[PDB]
Design an enzyme around this catalytic site. Structure first.
Site, PDB file in Angstrom:
ATOM      1  N   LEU A   1       0.826  -1.201   0.000  1.00 36.62           N
ATOM      2  CA  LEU A   1       0.000   0.000   0.000  1.00 36.62           C
ATOM      3  C   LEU A   1       0.864   1.257   0.000  1.00 36.62           C
ATOM      4  O   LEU A   1       0.492   2.277  -0.570  1.00 36.62           O
ATOM      5  CB  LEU A   1      -0.916   0.005   1.230  1.00 36.62           C
ATOM      6  CG  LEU A   1      -2.298  -0.658   1.104  1.00 36.62           C
ATOM      7  CD1 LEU A   1      -2.398  -1.433  -0.194  1.00 36.62           C
ATOM      8  CD2 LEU A   1      -2.538  -1.554   2.306  1.00 36.62           C
TER       9      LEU A   1
ATOM     10  N   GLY B   1       6.401   3.524   4.115  1.00 36.31           N
ATOM     11  CA  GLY B   1       6.787   4.693   4.880  1.00 36.31           C
ATOM     12  C   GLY B   1       8.282   4.700   5.128  1.00 36.31           C
ATOM     13  O   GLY B   1       8.982   3.748   4.787  1.00 36.31           O
TER      14      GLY B   1
ATOM     15  N   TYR C   1       9.889   4.528   7.990  1.00 35.61           N
ATOM     16  CA  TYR C   1      10.219   3.503   8.978  1.00 35.61           C
ATOM     17  C   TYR C   1       9.909   2.056   8.578  1.00 35.61           C
ATOM     18  O   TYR C   1      10.249   1.127   9.304  1.00 35.61           O
ATOM     19  CB  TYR C   1       9.515   3.827  10.316  1.00 35.61           C
TER      20      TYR C   1
ATOM     21  N   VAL D   1       3.743  -0.772   4.408  1.00 36.22           N
ATOM     22  CA  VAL D   1       2.379  -1.143   4.741  1.00 36.22           C
ATOM     23  C   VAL D   1       1.880  -2.011   3.602  1.00 36.22           C
ATOM     24  O   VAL D   1       2.029  -1.653   2.448  1.00 36.22           O
ATOM     25  CB  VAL D   1       1.472   0.100   4.859  1.00 36.22           C
ATOM     26  CG1 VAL D   1       0.038  -0.322   5.134  1.00 36.22           C
ATOM     27  CG2 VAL D   1       1.978   1.003   5.964  1.00 36.22           C
TER      28      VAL D   1
ATOM     29  N   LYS E   1       0.842  -2.824   8.957  1.00 32.86           N
ATOM     30  CA  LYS E   1       1.984  -1.935   9.058  1.00 32.86           C
ATOM     31  C   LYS E   1       3.124  -2.809   9.551  1.00 32.86           C
ATOM     32  O   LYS E   1       3.046  -3.393  10.620  1.00 32.86           O
ATOM     33  CB  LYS E   1       1.695  -0.796  10.060  1.00 32.86           C
ATOM     34  CG  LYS E   1       2.699   0.348  10.162  1.00 32.86           C
ATOM     35  CD  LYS E   1       2.139   1.486  11.008  1.00 32.86           C
ATOM     36  CE  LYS E   1       3.092   2.673  11.083  1.00 32.86           C
ATOM     37  NZ  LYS E   1       4.323   2.371  11.868  1.00 32.86           N
TER      38      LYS E   1
ATOM     39  N   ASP F   1       0.473  15.398  13.551  1.00 35.26           N
ATOM     40  CA  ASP F   1       1.004  15.333  12.193  1.00 35.26           C
ATOM     41  C   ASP F   1      -0.103  15.189  11.162  1.00 35.26           C
ATOM     42  O   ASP F   1      -0.026  14.352  10.271  1.00 35.26           O
ATOM     43  CB  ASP F   1       2.010  14.150  12.036  1.00 35.26           C
ATOM     44  CG  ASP F   1       2.896  14.287  10.794  1.00 35.26           C
ATOM     45  OD1 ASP F   1       3.466  13.265  10.356  1.00 35.26           O
ATOM     46  OD2 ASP F   1       3.034  15.410  10.257  1.00 35.26           O
TER      47      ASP F   1
HETATM   48  N1  LIG Z   1      -1.354  -1.510  -7.631  1.00 33.49           N
HETATM   49  C1  LIG Z   1      -0.616  -1.062  -6.431  1.00 33.49           C
HETATM   50  C2  LIG Z   1      -0.953   0.426  -6.149  1.00 33.49           C
HETATM   51  C3  LIG Z   1      -0.253   0.920  -4.867  1.00 33.49           C
HETATM   52  C4  LIG Z   1      -0.715   2.341  -4.543  1.00 33.49           C
HETATM   53  N2  LIG Z   1      -2.193   2.313  -4.347  1.00 33.49           N
HETATM   54  C5  LIG Z   1      -2.817   3.548  -3.817  1.00 33.49           C
HETATM   55  C6  LIG Z   1      -3.482   3.208  -2.505  1.00 33.49           C
HETATM   56  C7  LIG Z   1      -4.827   2.602  -2.461  1.00 33.49           C
HETATM   57  C8  LIG Z   1      -5.363   2.204  -1.153  1.00 33.49           C
HETATM   58  C9  LIG Z   1      -4.542   2.427   0.027  1.00 33.49           C
HETATM   59  N3  LIG Z   1      -4.817   2.128   1.350  1.00 33.49           N
HETATM   60  C10 LIG Z   1      -3.713   2.494   2.143  1.00 33.49           C
HETATM   61  C11 LIG Z   1      -3.598   2.331   3.622  1.00 33.49           C
HETATM   62  C12 LIG Z   1      -2.554   2.831   4.321  1.00 33.49           C
HETATM   63  C13 LIG Z   1      -2.544   2.737   5.778  1.00 33.49           C
HETATM   64  C14 LIG Z   1      -1.468   3.377   6.509  1.00 33.49           C
HETATM   65  C15 LIG Z   1      -1.537   3.338   7.963  1.00 33.49           C
HETATM   66  C16 LIG Z   1      -2.657   2.702   8.651  1.00 33.49           C
HETATM   67  C17 LIG Z   1      -3.710   2.028   7.913  1.00 33.49           C
HETATM   68  C18 LIG Z   1      -3.627   2.067   6.474  1.00 33.49           C
HETATM   69  N4  LIG Z   1      -4.643   1.538   5.731  1.00 33.49           N
HETATM   70  C19 LIG Z   1      -4.681   1.623   4.381  1.00 33.49           C
HETATM   71  O1  LIG Z   1      -5.592   1.133   3.723  1.00 33.49           O
HETATM   72  C20 LIG Z   1      -2.752   3.087   1.289  1.00 33.49           C
HETATM   73  C21 LIG Z   1      -3.213   3.027  -0.033  1.00 33.49           C
HETATM   74  C22 LIG Z   1      -2.676   3.427  -1.310  1.00 33.49           C
HETATM   75  C23 LIG Z   1      -2.844   1.987  -5.630  1.00 33.49           C
HETATM   76  C24 LIG Z   1      -2.458   0.558  -5.979  1.00 33.49           C
END
Ligand SMILES: NCC1CCN(Cc2ccc3[nH]c(-c4cc5ccccc5[nH]c4=O)cc3c2)CC1
Length: 272
Positions: free
Chosen positions: A14, A17, A19, A22, A37, A126
């Site tokens: 996802l 970071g 550190y 994810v 994480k 933050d």
């Molecule tokens: N085909 C791979 C790509 C990779 C980048 N992606 C964008 C994206 C879609 C959904 C998405 N969900 C996250 C998350 C980060 C995150 C960070 C800290 C605590 C809980 C969570 N939960 C999450 O849910 C980050 C993220 C980033 C689109 C797909």
């Protein structure tokens, strides 16, 4: 009792970071999705221990849910809520922002989350678009409590003195004073987030007199680049939020009474 219900597969990353990283984890049996994480302690026991503690206390629809954590030697595995919508950062068009109605609705959700956090005595420290996630229905969720702390315990507030956050989103008092109130600092960062959603740009690198952009704002030069594209109503709210003196800055209770905050702008999800 059901056999393989505890097994999870790591489908993708996802976001990695500073550190760590994810990843999106899917349950082998139920196919329930959750974010994991992954942090390598041997690179911090104190930080991660605090983050886990604060997360366990959180339960609100606008705050990323914490499911649990697994030791596994020196590789802490934090199981958190999966938000398929990604980061709010990616919903902001560079130099444009986004439709005012969307920004208003994301701002409402942001205030609800922050009111909850402050009500339980914790400050995030933050707040920025990269830490604001969207679930499938575009509901905002405040995430990443690695820099958060308790500012009120046993009904007694403690002033903060540690400098942390992100320069562009940080309140001026954090750079000028030794001690400061927690709440106004998160309010300020929410103001920079609102500016970002409405203008698609940050107003300054940091809120210092030395920064030309910041000086111009204090001199009310709203005809300049960022402020010129926002619009009267929301701009008036920003004037109350981005106030240098933290004791004079608007509070959340008053933000909820602001004209723009209460202006009818957006309809519900097309076809109920
Ligand atoms: N085909 C791979 C790509 C990779 C980048 N992606 C964008 C994206 C879609 C959904 C998405 N969900 C996250 C998350 C980060 C995150 C960070 C800290 C605590 C809980 C969570 N939960 C999450 O849910 C980050 C993220 C980033 C689109 C797909």
């Amino acid at each position: 009792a059901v056999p393989f219900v505890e097994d999870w597969d790591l489908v993708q990353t996802l976001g990695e970071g500073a550190y760590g990283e994810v990843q999106l984890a899917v349950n082998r049996v139920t196919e329930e999705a959750v974010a994991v994480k992954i942090v390598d302690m041997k690179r911090c026991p104190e930080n991660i221990k605090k983050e886990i503690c604060i997360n366990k206390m959180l339960n609100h629809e606008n705050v990323v849910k914490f499911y649990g954590h697994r030791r596994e030697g020196n590789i802490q595995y934090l199981f958190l809520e999966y938000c398929s919508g990604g980061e709010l950062f990616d919903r902001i068009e560079p130099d444009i922002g986004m439709p005012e109605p969307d920004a208003q609705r994301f701002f409402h959700q942001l205030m609800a989350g922050v009111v909850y956090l402050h009500g339980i005595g914790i400050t995030h420290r933050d707040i920025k678009p990269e830490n604001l996630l969207l679930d499938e229905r575009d509901n905002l969720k405040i995430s990443d409590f690695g820099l958060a702390t308790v500012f009120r315990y046993n009904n007694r507030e403690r002033l903060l003195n540690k400098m942390c956050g992100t320069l562009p989103y940080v309140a001026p008092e954090l750079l000028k004073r030794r001690e400061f109130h927690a709440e106004p600092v998160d309010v300020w960062s929410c103001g920079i987030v609102l500016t970002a959603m409405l203008a698609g740009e940050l107003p300054w690198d940091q809120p210092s007199d030395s920064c030309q952009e910041y000086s111009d704002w204090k001199e009310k030069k709203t005809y300049l680049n960022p402020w010129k594209k926002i619009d009267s109503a929301p701009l008036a709210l920003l004037h109350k939020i981005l106030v240098e003196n933290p004791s004079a800055r608007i509070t959340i209770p008053d933000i909820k009474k602001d004209r723009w905050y209460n202006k009818p702008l957006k309809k519900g999800a097309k076809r109920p």
